[PDB]
Design a protein around this nucleic acid. Structure first.
Length: 227
DNA sequence: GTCGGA
């Protein structure tokens, strides 16, 4: 899960959470406007610190100094709480990345067709994230990862993994600093949105190229073509 | 100390 859309205003997404949250985040009513959010850019990320919600631009990717490979963009839910690498992020670095949906490229051999995946009920999504705190320091290499889960039901036909998408109520619990890593694992296991609540459709090849932009990137195309 | 198109 390496591309998604985050096009609406921050208040549009925060409106889905508990009522006393949209006020914690300062007012900025500009639509975020991003139909092609890619790794290695700064992405607005929601988290809680000192008992208050914050929305911070955080690098999408994780590469500490001892990691001499390209930054990771995902963390597997099955093992992240116990990983030597991710355990500290699971414990103290949990965060939420809201989106309109995400893109996955179905493969035949190495040829690909992008699909956009979204809530059938028309709502946005809250993706579970873990990252390096303090998030506000604008680090250029130790940022956040999107947690992944096994694809289920019809999503298996597009790809065998999916982002961990949490219900609004679960997303709020996930961000709390006062919960244990074990509680977080139970939130991830209890609050995940199931595959039957999503729909998807093929989109134009244009989105694969990070250069391309705009609302047309999430519009359906008629023909599926693996290229 | 691990998991995306071009």
């Amino acid at each position: 899960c390496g591309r998604f859309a985050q096009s609406q205003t921050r208040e549009d997404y925060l409106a889905l959470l508990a009522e006393d949250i949209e006020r914690d985040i300062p007012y900025d009513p500009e639509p975020i406007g991003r139909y092609n959010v890619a790794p290695g850019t700064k992405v607005l990320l929601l988290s809680e610190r000192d008992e208050h919600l914050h929305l911070d631009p955080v690098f999408w990717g994780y590469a500490p100094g001892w990691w001499d490979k390209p930054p990771l963009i995902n963390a597997r839910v099955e093992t992240a709480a116990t990983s030597r690498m991710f355990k500290p992020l699971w414990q103290h670095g949990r965060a939420i990345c809201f989106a309109d949906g995400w893109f996955e490229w179905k493969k035949e051999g190495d040829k690909k067709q992008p699909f956009f995946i979204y809530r059938a009920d028309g709502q946005p999504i809250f993706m579970a994230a873990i990252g390096s705190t303090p998030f506000e320091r604008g680090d250029e290499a130790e940022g956040f990862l999107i947690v992944t889960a096994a694809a289920d039901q019809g999503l298996v036909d597009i790809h065998d993994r999916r982002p961990l998408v949490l219900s609004p109520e679960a997303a709020r619990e996930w961000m709390r600093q006062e919960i244990s890593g074990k509680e977080a694992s139970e939130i991830a296991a209890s609050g995940c949105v199931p595959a039957n609540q999503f729909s998807w459709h093929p989109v134009s090849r244009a989105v694969g190229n990070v250069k391309n932009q705009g609302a047309e990137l999430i519009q359906p195309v008629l023909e599926v073509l693996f290229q």
